[PDB]
Write a protein that binds this ligand. Structure first.
Ligand SMILES: C=C1/C(=C\C=C(/CC)c2cccc(CCC#CCC(C)(C)O)c2)C[C@@H](O)C[C@@H]1O
Ligand SMILES: C=C1/C(=C\C=C(/CC)c2cccc(CCC#CCC(C)(C)O)c2)C[C@@H](O)C[C@@H]1O
Lengths: 10, 239, 239, 10
């Protein structure tokens, strides 16, 4: 989960 | 007394972080689904909040130490605190004269009625506007404003947090900076630090009410389909 | 020969269904995130496709019999066929003169270049435009156009379908209507039914290429976060 | 799953 968060957190 | 070198560097980093992630021109707002005045403002405000979450993530990544936390803690902190940072950062567009958030043009002026047309009620919007009024009356320095956002973000007392000790130590350092800044640089601010910590308490309460009302939205697919993937993820309940 | 009463009622229902779900004024398009000309058209085209999926769902619900299928079959059919119905229904805005989809104003005129700026390549857009050109040259009657969309929707040979026999019987009835309509009402259409069934084959191929390229988008969170929840659900891979 | 589809399909 949290696919977009991980990406945004680099 | 006097601020130390490391305290100075912290303030400088937080101010630069905010300047990089808050655009006073609001020219990006034309990219959102347009405002419409059943829940006619939900598409526009969903886009505004989604955009704002990205900015809070960008701000968080530049708080000293936040980056060195585990990925899980970074997410836990952002999921619990993003709504509070958005309420804090929106004070910069709030107008005491209009009782509204004015974002560079009448299309992007949001009054309380606009927010009710995104699915929220006065149970949230009455304390939220009183919160914005009292915060605006504090006449915070930009330094104090960004410290308060960072302190709110780095609260270890949020669900899902693992490295409680490490996050509390980071927040403790920022609180120390804020107290010293107010004492040295803010004339007549002897009651200011206490008023600011009260605002953090108010935000917990605004958080709970927003979460209540967001849950109602997110349980009706005709409304939740209007949200963005990022809003669904950050305000959602997955662990 | 002559069309029967029940065949007539089917045609009437499908035409009314299309008229209720396709708005030639395109005035809803101003509600989408605006077009921008890395993937600058992805927000606008995501919104356009999401809107179009809702319209295809509305159209499907008015196909005689589709409603009486199980919820699982209704979903299985829409998930496999929605992209094909969108390509079919977009022929109504396609212009042979402009080689583009013209939706009531230059802001909503989409050329091939606009679609590449939503993450697609010529591997899809070259066959898609040739498809639109050949379909447009068929000069389909409105009756034939809506029958072809309904036949495409009611194909039983799609993954996830359970009641194969029932759906095939529904599609068989519509094919019978279309053949009879062309023979009786379309002058010089002796080769038309065959050309239309070929277009259904072309759509399987366009479906596969779009799914390939959509998968690439949906695997990059910086792009998938620009999609809508409805697009994520309908074009997603869950069963 | 298919929360929005179910809702739209009434
Ligand atoms: C977001 C920002 C702003 C306004 C916030 C407002 C008023 C419209 C506001 C007003 C009420 C509640 C909330 C909290 C976020 C929310 C929401 C809507 C949904 C449907 C997602 O619950 C925000 C503008 C600007 O200063 C940027 C800031 O990040
Ligand atoms: C959607 C409709 C239209 C245009 C379709 C186009 C051209 C922009 C088009 C052009 C290329 C590909 C596709 C298929 C859908 C797609 C896509 C984009 C994403 C990123 C979701 O893959 C559609 C306009 C109008 O007749 C309505 C119709 O439903």
């Amino acid at each position: 989960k949290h696919k977009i968060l991980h990406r945004l957190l680099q | 007394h006097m601020l130390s070198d490391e305290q100075m560097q912290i303030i400088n980093s937080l101010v630069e972080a905010h300047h990089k992630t808050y655009d006073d021109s609001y020219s990006d707002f034309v990219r959102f689904r347009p405002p419409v005045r059943r829940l006619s403002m939900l598409p526009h405000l969903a886009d505004l909040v989604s955009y704002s979450i990205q900015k809070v993530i960008g701000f968080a990544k530049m708080i000293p130490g936040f980056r060195d936390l585990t990925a899980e803690d970074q997410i836990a902190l952002l999921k619990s605190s993003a709504i509070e940072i958005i309420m804090l950062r929106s004070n910069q567009s709030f107008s005491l004269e209009d009782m509204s958030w004015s974002c560079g043009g009448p299309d992007f002026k949001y009054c309380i009625n606009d927010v009710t047309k995104a699915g929220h009620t006065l149970e949230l919007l009455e304390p939220l506007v009183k919160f914005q009024v009292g915060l605006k009356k504090l006449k915070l320095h930009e330094e104090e404003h960004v410290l308060l956002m960072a302190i709110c973000l780095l609260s270890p007392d949020r669900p899902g947090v693992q490295d409680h000790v490490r996050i509390e130590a980071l927040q403790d350092r920022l609180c120390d900076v804020l107290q010293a800044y107010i004492r040295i640089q803010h004339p007549g601010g002897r009651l200011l630090y206490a008023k600011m910590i009260q605002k953090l308490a108010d935000l917990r309460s605004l958080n709970e009410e927003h979460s209540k009302q967001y849950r109602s939205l997110s349980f009706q697919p005709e409304h939740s389909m209007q949200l963005t993937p990022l809003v669904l993820e950050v305000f959602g309940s997955e662990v």
